[PDB]
Amino acid sequence: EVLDPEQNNTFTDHYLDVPYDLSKVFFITTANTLQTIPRPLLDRMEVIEIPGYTNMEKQAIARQYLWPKQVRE
Amino acid sequence: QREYYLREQMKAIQKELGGEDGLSDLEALRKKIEEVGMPEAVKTKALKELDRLERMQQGSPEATVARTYLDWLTEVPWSKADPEVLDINHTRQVLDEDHYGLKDVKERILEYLAVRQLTQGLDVRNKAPILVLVGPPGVGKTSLGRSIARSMNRKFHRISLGGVRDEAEIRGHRRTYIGAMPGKLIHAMKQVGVINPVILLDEIDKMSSDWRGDPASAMLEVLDPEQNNTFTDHYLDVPYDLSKVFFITTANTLQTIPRPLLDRMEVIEIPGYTNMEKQAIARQYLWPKQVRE
Amino acid sequence: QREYYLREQMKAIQKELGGEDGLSDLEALRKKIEEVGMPEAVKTKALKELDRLERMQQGSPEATVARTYLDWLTEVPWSKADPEVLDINHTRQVLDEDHYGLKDVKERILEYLAVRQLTQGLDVRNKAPILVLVGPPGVGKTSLGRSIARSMNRKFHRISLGGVRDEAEIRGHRRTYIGAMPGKLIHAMKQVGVINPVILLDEIDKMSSDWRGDPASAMLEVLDPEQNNTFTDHYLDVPYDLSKVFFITTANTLQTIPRPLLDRMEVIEIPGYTNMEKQAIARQYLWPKQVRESGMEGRIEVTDAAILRVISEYTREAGVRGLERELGKIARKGAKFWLEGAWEGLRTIDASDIPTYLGIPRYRPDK
Amino acid sequence: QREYYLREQMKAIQKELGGEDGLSDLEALRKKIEEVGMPEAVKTKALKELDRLERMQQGSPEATVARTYLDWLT
Amino acid sequence: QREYYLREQMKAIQKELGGEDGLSDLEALRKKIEEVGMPEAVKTKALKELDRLERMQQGSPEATVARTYLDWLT
Ligand SMILES: Nc1ncnc2c1ncn2[C@@H]1O[C@H](COP(=O)(O)OP(=O)(O)OP(O)(O)=S)[C@@H](O)[C@H]1O
Ligand SMILES: Nc1ncnc2c1ncn2[C@@H]1O[C@H](COP(=O)(O)OP(=O)(O)OP(O)(O)=S)[C@@H](O)[C@H]1O
């Protein structure tokens, strides 16, 4: 009910007996596999797969982000 | 002369300690009970508990309980209804404006209207359908409910039963308790103004069911096609008829519905679309929507 | 002190509602208490609570509690019963008008009536059996309650126990609370006017438990025929007799009924219907009521072979809700065909015209 | 009579703290219930709950539920 | 003497707001304890939970708990 992209204009919990509007809120959900998400819940979300890094972009991350941070701390 | 002079004295005592109520709106409740619906046993017990509020004094914490019971009892509709639409062609037009395909559901609605045309007063039973729409996760069977409700010129209200686990959400709590009020059905019948709504029960196959909470066995006598004209709440203790309510329920599978609840409902399969149907849906419903937005 | 003075004059006016408030109380209820006919200990408790409903003033929150407890104690039936039937042939003829088949249940009811009519002098008898109807969904369990109650010329009341979780529905709350109502059983006894109704307790196998106990423990008190003659709720502080009530209960399976309840019950199983039984109850019961409700009577009919087609090739069940949904579908299609051009007389639906009305068959017959 | 005068004194204290302040509670909630941009179908429920609240007892076990509900709405 | 003097005052007040001995309680269920059993520790405990029902309000929930307790212990 909270992630339905057509019907979350009217979300109703049990304490507030009124419909509340959740259509403007930017949801970002995080997972690490898709197999344990039930199929009606997976259909409501847009998938973006982040694959894992190669060695030269690991070098770029280590030069530009990780090593100055570990030096300052 | 003497008895209405006695009324003059009690009026003097009342308005010198008047609350702008206690004689200003108790008799408004007296007028409002008698003018709206309310079969005879209900109005007898209602006037019985109306004449035993007047000697509470608000300054009576049980005066709140009785007045809120009366205001749940008078604002739930009794015999107020929307007419049936006779233009079956106009209903066909409005159903074709919203969705592509889906001939089975549309023919079900048009046959309901054809039956309601041939009964223009015959003293027969008027029993509204109880449906379950079953299909794959993407096929539109939630938007179809309010498309039906707009095409028939009826009122619409949606209830989500997706994670509901307690029985106090279908029926209420008793009037004894501090903050009690009825279940979602009586509240939905109060939000809607009539006795002919289209109530979408959003997913009927996802209710929790164990030895510590099973609402799926309290949905029996809500969806019973023979006995839901005497549905009894726990807050209201009068029998209240739900036999005129057009209930549409939705599910993705039939295996997780309890078997005494499944055969209460007429099952309409919605199978999933072919490539020509998806091309037509994409041409005249989805692409103009995305281009506008 | 002004407002004390003012409703002091109001209660002095209440001494002269009609020249007195007595007719509404000491003379309302003192007339109503022996107008009914009530036992002696409850008469003692009623008189020596009207003794202090006498003394107090109206309006104050200690008089409304006592007055509602006196009003609820006056309108519960004490020693008033419907007459007993002495002709079991009339009971057999009434039971055969509402249902078809179901021979063992009907003859068990006739055995109970014969036992109670032959035995009215030894005073161990006349404990009514706690009947349990067990079967698949769709067989006539719930309808037999009203059919049996019409057969014995008694009054009927149905209580649904499908999702009852609180124990305060069976046995109520004490009348010292700010809101106070009795249980559902004594409310049902107020609904009927007699001491011997037929109470249908529907779906006893589906009661839910909670903390503060489960309502099966409170249900065991009323449904045990050796302790239900002194049944005590908490609203009424007195024992009440519920031994003359004929209880009928329904269930779908036995494995979820509590063990101290199954030891006091006599199960009667309803097996499910064969095809000849299904077409008999479709000729006699389902098809006329599906044609009346469509407004198509005198305009469309169906043969026996067509009903056998509908049973064999479109249903797989034990009950008959699906069969009447199919017959209602045929009546709807006829009602829609009527509006797009009428006919005279009545057309008769044959077994070769069924796929026009119901579509492609969904089960294949054996050959 | 002494403690009657005591409770009557403290009731006189609470009905005017500074100049007024006796009714800053429900009148401030009446202001706040219309300063926010609620839909009308929620405003009707809120005003009916507040009118049902204003007859009650200040400090009842049945008043704090309604006041907490109105606070969650505001 | 002081027992039936102060209870004589109990009687003389309860006679008009109660029409003579009220409820048959409060003097002779005091005598029903000595005619059944009992160990003396049980007897003094019964007298202690008996004498707390003396002035406590009739129509209150705690009194009924104490009432059924001393009636079932009897
Ligand atoms: N035939 C159709 N014509 C037009 N729009 C359609 C059609 N079928 C589906 N849609 C659209 O598809 C979307 C999904 O509809 P939903 O009713 O939400 O599907 P749903 O089956 O109810 O999802 P769940 O997971 O089963 S609750 C909606 O925006 C519909 O408008
Ligand atoms: N032998 C029969 N003769 C006539 N009508 C019957 C017969 N058996 C069943 N029916 C009808 O079948 C319908 C279903 O009856 P019910 O008693 O409500 O079923 P049920 O056994 O109570 O089902 P559940 O799921 O346990 S509530 C009613 O309309 C009955 O009139």
Tab-separated table of N, CA and C in Angstrom, chain B residues 57-177:
chain	number	residue	atom	x	y	z
B	57	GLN	N	-25.936	14.632	33.086
B	57	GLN	CA	-25.868	16.094	33.146
B	57	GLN	C	-24.629	16.715	32.503
B	58	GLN	N	-23.809	15.918	31.814
B	58	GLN	CA	-22.544	16.283	31.164
B	58	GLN	C	-21.580	16.944	32.123
B	59	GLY	N	-20.921	16.097	32.872
B	59	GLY	CA	-20.752	16.196	34.295
B	59	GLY	C	-21.235	14.813	34.653
B	60	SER	N	-21.508	14.049	33.574
B	60	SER	CA	-21.682	12.624	33.455
B	60	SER	C	-20.733	12.091	32.390
B	61	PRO	N	-19.705	11.330	32.799
B	61	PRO	CA	-18.774	10.749	31.817
B	61	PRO	C	-19.365	9.585	31.047
B	62	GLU	N	-20.497	9.048	31.491
B	62	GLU	CA	-21.298	8.129	30.702
B	62	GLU	C	-22.306	8.847	29.810
B	63	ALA	N	-22.399	10.182	29.887
B	63	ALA	CA	-23.210	10.900	28.909
B	63	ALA	C	-22.497	10.983	27.563
B	64	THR	N	-21.159	11.046	27.585
B	64	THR	CA	-20.368	11.017	26.355
B	64	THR	C	-20.504	9.686	25.630
B	65	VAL	N	-20.485	8.577	26.376
B	65	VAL	CA	-20.553	7.244	25.775
B	65	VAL	C	-21.895	7.037	25.084
B	66	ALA	N	-22.978	7.436	25.752
B	66	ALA	CA	-24.301	7.291	25.163
B	66	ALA	C	-24.514	8.241	23.989
B	67	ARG	N	-23.998	9.475	24.057
B	67	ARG	CA	-24.213	10.382	22.932
B	67	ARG	C	-23.371	9.983	21.723
B	68	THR	N	-22.167	9.450	21.946
B	68	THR	CA	-21.390	8.970	20.811
B	68	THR	C	-21.961	7.686	20.236
B	69	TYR	N	-22.608	6.860	21.062
B	69	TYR	CA	-23.330	5.721	20.507
B	69	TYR	C	-24.510	6.173	19.657
B	70	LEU	N	-25.248	7.189	20.111
B	70	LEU	CA	-26.355	7.699	19.309
B	70	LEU	C	-25.890	8.394	18.037
B	71	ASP	N	-24.722	9.032	18.056
B	71	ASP	CA	-24.239	9.690	16.851
B	71	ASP	C	-23.507	8.739	15.912
B	72	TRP	N	-23.064	7.575	16.388
B	72	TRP	CA	-22.759	6.518	15.432
B	72	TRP	C	-24.029	5.889	14.892
B	73	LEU	N	-25.104	5.892	15.676
B	73	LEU	CA	-26.313	5.184	15.285
B	73	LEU	C	-27.178	5.972	14.309
B	74	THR	N	-27.130	7.302	14.339
B	74	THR	CA	-27.973	8.096	13.452
B	74	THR	C	-27.311	8.489	12.137
B	75	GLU	N	-25.981	8.519	12.063
B	75	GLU	CA	-25.285	8.943	10.853
B	75	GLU	C	-24.881	7.800	9.933
B	76	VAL	N	-24.956	6.557	10.388
B	76	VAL	CA	-24.899	5.395	9.507
B	76	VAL	C	-26.219	5.340	8.743
B	77	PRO	N	-26.200	5.237	7.412
B	77	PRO	CA	-27.438	5.404	6.645
B	77	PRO	C	-28.363	4.204	6.757
B	78	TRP	N	-29.657	4.498	6.813
B	78	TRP	CA	-30.717	3.496	6.855
B	78	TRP	C	-31.672	3.852	5.719
B	79	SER	N	-31.702	3.017	4.678
B	79	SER	CA	-32.629	3.122	3.539
B	79	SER	C	-32.499	4.453	2.796
B	80	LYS	N	-31.277	4.774	2.387
B	80	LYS	CA	-31.015	5.885	1.484
B	80	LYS	C	-30.120	5.367	0.371
B	81	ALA	N	-30.541	5.556	-0.876
B	81	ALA	CA	-29.928	4.803	-1.958
B	81	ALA	C	-29.814	5.658	-3.208
B	82	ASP	N	-28.877	5.269	-4.065
B	82	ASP	CA	-28.706	5.831	-5.391
B	82	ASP	C	-29.528	5.037	-6.402
B	83	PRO	N	-30.068	5.691	-7.428
B	83	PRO	CA	-30.862	4.967	-8.421
B	83	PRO	C	-29.997	4.131	-9.343
B	84	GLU	N	-30.615	3.114	-9.931
B	84	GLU	CA	-29.948	2.354	-10.976
B	84	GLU	C	-29.999	3.109	-12.300
B	85	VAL	N	-28.882	3.089	-13.016
B	85	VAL	CA	-28.788	3.731	-14.320
B	85	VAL	C	-29.445	2.827	-15.356
B	86	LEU	N	-30.241	3.420	-16.240
B	86	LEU	CA	-30.957	2.656	-17.249
B	86	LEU	C	-30.271	2.684	-18.604
B	87	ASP	N	-29.451	3.689	-18.878
B	87	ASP	CA	-28.735	3.761	-20.142
B	87	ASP	C	-27.617	2.735	-20.105
B	88	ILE	N	-27.877	1.568	-20.681
B	88	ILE	CA	-26.858	0.537	-20.735
B	88	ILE	C	-25.797	0.893	-21.775
B	89	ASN	N	-26.165	1.686	-22.786
B	89	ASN	CA	-25.199	2.112	-23.789
B	89	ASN	C	-24.219	3.120	-23.216
B	90	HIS	N	-24.707	4.032	-22.374
B	90	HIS	CA	-23.835	5.008	-21.736
B	90	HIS	C	-22.863	4.335	-20.779
B	91	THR	N	-23.319	3.289	-20.091
B	91	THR	CA	-22.435	2.532	-19.217
B	91	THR	C	-21.382	1.780	-20.021
B	92	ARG	N	-21.757	1.269	-21.199
B	92	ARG	CA	-20.775	0.636	-22.074
B	92	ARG	C	-19.728	1.637	-22.559
B	93	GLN	N	-20.159	2.861	-22.883
B	93	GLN	CA	-19.228	3.906	-23.310
B	93	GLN	C	-18.244	4.268	-22.205
B	94	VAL	N	-18.747	4.459	-20.985
B	94	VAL	CA	-17.871	4.869	-19.893
B	94	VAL	C	-16.925	3.739	-19.496
B	95	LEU	N	-17.363	2.481	-19.596
B	95	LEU	CA	-16.437	1.382	-19.337
B	95	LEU	C	-15.376	1.263	-20.418
B	96	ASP	N	-15.709	1.574	-21.667
B	96	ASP	CA	-14.681	1.541	-22.697
B	96	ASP	C	-13.756	2.748	-22.670
B	97	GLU	N	-14.122	3.829	-21.982
B	97	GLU	CA	-13.208	4.966	-21.890
B	97	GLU	C	-11.990	4.699	-21.017
B	98	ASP	N	-12.057	3.747	-20.093
B	98	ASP	CA	-11.008	3.598	-19.094
B	98	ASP	C	-10.037	2.462	-19.354
B	99	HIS	N	-10.494	1.333	-19.878
B	99	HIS	CA	-9.624	0.184	-20.027
B	99	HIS	C	-9.828	-0.423	-21.399
B	100	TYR	N	-8.785	-1.070	-21.889
B	100	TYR	CA	-8.834	-1.801	-23.140
B	100	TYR	C	-9.050	-3.268	-22.824
B	101	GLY	N	-9.832	-3.940	-23.652
B	101	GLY	CA	-10.068	-5.350	-23.444
B	101	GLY	C	-11.000	-5.592	-22.274
B	102	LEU	N	-10.708	-6.667	-21.536
B	102	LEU	CA	-11.416	-7.106	-20.335
B	102	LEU	C	-12.909	-7.294	-20.564
B	103	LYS	N	-13.281	-8.139	-21.522
B	103	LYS	CA	-14.683	-8.289	-21.888
B	103	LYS	C	-15.516	-8.984	-20.824
B	104	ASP	N	-14.909	-9.838	-19.999
B	104	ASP	CA	-15.681	-10.629	-19.047
B	104	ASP	C	-16.245	-9.772	-17.927
B	105	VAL	N	-15.430	-8.872	-17.382
B	105	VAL	CA	-15.877	-8.013	-16.293
B	105	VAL	C	-16.920	-7.021	-16.790
B	106	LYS	N	-16.720	-6.497	-17.998
B	106	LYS	CA	-17.659	-5.540	-18.559
B	106	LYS	C	-18.988	-6.202	-18.881
B	107	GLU	N	-18.957	-7.445	-19.366
B	107	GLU	CA	-20.207	-8.155	-19.593
B	107	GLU	C	-20.905	-8.515	-18.290
B	108	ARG	N	-20.148	-8.791	-17.224
B	108	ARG	CA	-20.760	-9.011	-15.915
B	108	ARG	C	-21.522	-7.779	-15.440
B	109	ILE	N	-20.925	-6.597	-15.612
B	109	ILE	CA	-21.582	-5.363	-15.182
B	109	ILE	C	-22.820	-5.082	-16.026
B	110	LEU	N	-22.732	-5.301	-17.339
B	110	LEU	CA	-23.885	-5.022	-18.187
B	110	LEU	C	-25.022	-6.010	-17.955
B	111	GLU	N	-24.716	-7.244	-17.555
B	111	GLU	CA	-25.783	-8.182	-17.217
B	111	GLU	C	-26.434	-7.840	-15.887
B	112	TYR	N	-25.657	-7.319	-14.932
B	112	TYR	CA	-26.256	-6.794	-13.705
B	112	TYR	C	-27.228	-5.656	-13.998
B	113	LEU	N	-26.851	-4.752	-14.901
B	113	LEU	CA	-27.768	-3.673	-15.269
B	113	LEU	C	-28.984	-4.178	-16.041
B	114	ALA	N	-28.815	-5.219	-16.858
B	114	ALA	CA	-29.949	-5.791	-17.577
B	114	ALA	C	-30.932	-6.459	-16.630
B	115	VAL	N	-30.432	-7.092	-15.570
B	115	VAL	CA	-31.328	-7.667	-14.571
B	115	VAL	C	-32.044	-6.565	-13.804
B	116	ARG	N	-31.336	-5.478	-13.482
B	116	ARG	CA	-31.986	-4.396	-12.747
B	116	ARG	C	-32.992	-3.627	-13.593
B	117	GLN	N	-32.908	-3.709	-14.920
B	117	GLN	CA	-33.928	-3.048	-15.729
B	117	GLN	C	-35.231	-3.840	-15.752
B	118	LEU	N	-35.153	-5.166	-15.851
B	118	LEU	CA	-36.350	-6.000	-15.899
B	118	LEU	C	-37.043	-6.156	-14.556
B	119	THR	N	-36.517	-5.575	-13.494
B	119	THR	CA	-37.176	-5.563	-12.198
B	119	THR	C	-37.418	-4.108	-11.815
B	120	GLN	N	-38.605	-3.605	-12.129
B	120	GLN	CA	-38.984	-2.227	-11.838
B	120	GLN	C	-40.075	-2.229	-10.782
B	121	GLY	N	-39.889	-3.064	-9.775
B	121	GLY	CA	-40.870	-3.254	-8.736
B	121	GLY	C	-41.620	-4.533	-9.008
B	122	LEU	N	-41.178	-5.610	-8.371
B	122	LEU	CA	-41.822	-6.904	-8.467
B	122	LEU	C	-41.860	-7.618	-7.131
B	123	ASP	N	-41.297	-7.004	-6.083
B	123	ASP	CA	-41.104	-7.604	-4.759
B	123	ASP	C	-40.320	-8.913	-4.856
B	124	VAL	N	-39.075	-8.806	-5.314
B	124	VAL	CA	-38.152	-9.934	-5.320
B	124	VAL	C	-36.907	-9.515	-4.559
B	125	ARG	N	-36.008	-10.456	-4.301
B	125	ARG	CA	-34.760	-10.124	-3.638
B	125	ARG	C	-33.842	-9.349	-4.566
B	126	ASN	N	-33.266	-8.288	-4.022
B	126	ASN	CA	-32.210	-7.540	-4.674
B	126	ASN	C	-30.913	-7.878	-3.961
B	127	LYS	N	-30.078	-8.678	-4.607
B	127	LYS	CA	-28.826	-9.113	-4.014
B	127	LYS	C	-27.674	-8.703	-4.912
B	128	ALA	N	-26.794	-7.929	-4.386
B	128	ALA	CA	-25.646	-7.407	-5.102
B	128	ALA	C	-24.571	-8.476	-5.245
B	129	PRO	N	-23.799	-8.439	-6.331
B	129	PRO	CA	-22.755	-9.445	-6.537
B	129	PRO	C	-21.600	-9.319	-5.557
B	130	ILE	N	-20.883	-10.427	-5.398
B	130	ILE	CA	-19.643	-10.490	-4.637
B	130	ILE	C	-18.610	-11.151	-5.529
B	131	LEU	N	-17.583	-10.406	-5.911
B	131	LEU	CA	-16.651	-10.841	-6.935
B	131	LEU	C	-15.255	-10.996	-6.359
B	132	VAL	N	-14.451	-11.839	-6.996
B	132	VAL	CA	-13.016	-11.862	-6.755
B	132	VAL	C	-12.315	-11.873	-8.108
B	133	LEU	N	-11.353	-10.978	-8.278
B	133	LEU	CA	-10.619	-10.839	-9.524
B	133	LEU	C	-9.217	-11.386	-9.314
B	134	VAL	N	-8.847	-12.391	-10.099
B	134	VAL	CA	-7.610	-13.132	-9.894
B	134	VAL	C	-6.732	-12.976	-11.123
B	135	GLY	N	-5.456	-12.664	-10.908
B	135	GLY	CA	-4.552	-12.510	-12.019
B	135	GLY	C	-3.103	-12.246	-11.670
B	136	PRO	N	-2.274	-12.115	-12.703
B	136	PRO	CA	-0.860	-11.766	-12.523
B	136	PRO	C	-0.699	-10.355	-11.981
B	137	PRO	N	0.493	-9.989	-11.443
B	137	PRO	CA	0.595	-8.747	-10.663
B	137	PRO	C	0.438	-7.428	-11.399
B	138	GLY	N	0.513	-7.398	-12.724
B	138	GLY	CA	0.524	-6.111	-13.394
B	138	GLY	C	-0.785	-5.715	-14.029
B	139	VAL	N	-1.708	-6.657	-14.164
B	139	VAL	CA	-2.939	-6.433	-14.908
B	139	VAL	C	-3.864	-5.570	-14.067
B	140	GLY	N	-4.482	-4.567	-14.683
B	140	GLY	CA	-5.240	-3.617	-13.900
B	140	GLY	C	-6.523	-4.168	-13.334
B	141	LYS	N	-6.516	-4.472	-12.044
B	141	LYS	CA	-7.701	-5.000	-11.397
B	141	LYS	C	-7.929	-4.293	-10.073
B	142	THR	N	-7.174	-3.234	-9.817
B	142	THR	CA	-7.490	-2.283	-8.761
B	142	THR	C	-8.088	-1.003	-9.314
B	143	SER	N	-7.624	-0.549	-10.478
B	143	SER	CA	-8.208	0.629	-11.108
B	143	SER	C	-9.572	0.323	-11.703
B	144	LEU	N	-9.811	-0.950	-11.997
B	144	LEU	CA	-11.067	-1.379	-12.582
B	144	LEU	C	-12.223	-1.212	-11.613
B	145	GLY	N	-11.950	-1.257	-10.307
B	145	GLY	CA	-13.007	-1.091	-9.322
B	145	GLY	C	-13.635	0.287	-9.343
B	146	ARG	N	-12.819	1.328	-9.338
B	146	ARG	CA	-13.404	2.652	-9.404
B	146	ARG	C	-13.799	3.051	-10.813
B	147	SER	N	-13.281	2.375	-11.843
B	147	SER	CA	-13.875	2.545	-13.168
B	147	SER	C	-15.313	2.039	-13.202
B	148	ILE	N	-15.566	0.878	-12.589
B	148	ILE	CA	-16.923	0.342	-12.468
B	148	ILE	C	-17.805	1.277	-11.654
B	149	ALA	N	-17.272	1.783	-10.539
B	149	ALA	CA	-18.047	2.662	-9.669
B	149	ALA	C	-18.399	3.978	-10.349
B	150	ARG	N	-17.533	4.485	-11.228
B	150	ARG	CA	-17.898	5.704	-11.939
B	150	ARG	C	-18.871	5.410	-13.072
B	151	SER	N	-18.734	4.250	-13.716
B	151	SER	CA	-19.623	3.922	-14.822
B	151	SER	C	-21.043	3.637	-14.373
B	152	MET	N	-21.239	3.173	-13.146
B	152	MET	CA	-22.578	2.886	-12.657
B	152	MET	C	-23.192	4.034	-11.874
B	153	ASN	N	-22.502	5.178	-11.780
B	153	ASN	CA	-22.916	6.353	-10.997
B	153	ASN	C	-23.138	6.022	-9.524
B	154	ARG	N	-22.232	5.250	-8.944
B	154	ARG	CA	-22.305	4.886	-7.539
B	154	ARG	C	-21.158	5.510	-6.760
B	155	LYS	N	-21.192	5.317	-5.451
B	155	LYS	CA	-20.139	5.797	-4.575
B	155	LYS	C	-19.086	4.717	-4.390
B	156	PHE	N	-17.849	5.150	-4.191
B	156	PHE	CA	-16.706	4.257	-4.129
B	156	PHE	C	-15.970	4.438	-2.812
B	157	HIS	N	-15.444	3.338	-2.278
B	157	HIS	CA	-14.577	3.378	-1.113
B	157	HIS	C	-13.707	2.133	-1.113
B	158	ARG	N	-12.435	2.301	-0.768
B	158	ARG	CA	-11.446	1.239	-0.871
B	158	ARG	C	-10.906	0.898	0.507
B	159	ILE	N	-10.808	-0.393	0.796
B	159	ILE	CA	-10.248	-0.907	2.039
B	159	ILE	C	-9.107	-1.845	1.682
B	160	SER	N	-7.942	-1.628	2.285
B	160	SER	CA	-6.801	-2.506	2.077
B	160	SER	C	-6.686	-3.506	3.215
B	161	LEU	N	-6.719	-4.791	2.866
B	161	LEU	CA	-6.635	-5.864	3.848
B	161	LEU	C	-5.306	-6.597	3.758
B	162	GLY	N	-4.229	-5.890	3.422
B	162	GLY	CA	-2.988	-6.551	3.070
B	162	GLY	C	-2.227	-7.144	4.231
B	163	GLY	N	-2.183	-6.461	5.359
B	163	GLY	CA	-1.434	-7.003	6.470
B	163	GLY	C	-2.248	-7.109	7.734
B	164	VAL	N	-3.572	-7.034	7.599
B	164	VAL	CA	-4.449	-6.932	8.756
B	164	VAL	C	-4.448	-8.259	9.496
B	165	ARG	N	-4.233	-8.202	10.808
B	165	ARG	CA	-4.041	-9.407	11.592
B	165	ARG	C	-4.979	-9.528	12.779
B	166	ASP	N	-5.669	-8.466	13.172
B	166	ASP	CA	-6.561	-8.543	14.316
B	166	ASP	C	-8.022	-8.463	13.894
B	167	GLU	N	-8.874	-9.125	14.671
B	167	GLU	CA	-10.299	-9.182	14.400
B	167	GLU	C	-11.023	-7.920	14.823
B	168	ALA	N	-10.381	-7.061	15.609
B	168	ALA	CA	-10.966	-5.796	16.025
B	168	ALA	C	-10.901	-4.731	14.947
B	169	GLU	N	-10.480	-5.084	13.739
B	169	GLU	CA	-10.489	-4.169	12.618
B	169	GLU	C	-11.664	-4.429	11.686
B	170	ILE	N	-12.233	-5.628	11.726
B	170	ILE	CA	-13.448	-5.959	10.997
B	170	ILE	C	-14.683	-5.613	11.811
B	171	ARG	N	-14.834	-6.237	12.973
B	171	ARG	CA	-15.810	-5.842	13.973
B	171	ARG	C	-15.159	-4.804	14.874
B	172	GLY	N	-15.949	-4.170	15.720
B	172	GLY	CA	-15.399	-3.154	16.594
B	172	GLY	C	-14.977	-3.713	17.937
B	173	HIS	N	-14.853	-2.804	18.894
B	173	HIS	CA	-14.823	-3.136	20.306
B	173	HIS	C	-16.173	-2.785	20.912
B	174	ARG	N	-16.408	-3.259	22.131
B	174	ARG	CA	-17.673	-2.992	22.792
B	174	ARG	C	-17.739	-1.542	23.256
B	175	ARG	N	-18.951	-1.095	23.560
B	175	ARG	CA	-19.205	0.273	23.987
B	175	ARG	C	-18.656	0.566	25.384
B	176	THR	N	-18.324	-0.479	26.147
B	176	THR	CA	-17.781	-0.337	27.496
B	176	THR	C	-16.437	0.385	27.492
B	177	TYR	N	-15.584	0.068	26.519
B	177	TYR	CA	-14.198	0.516	26.513
B	177	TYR	C	-14.095	2.020	26.268
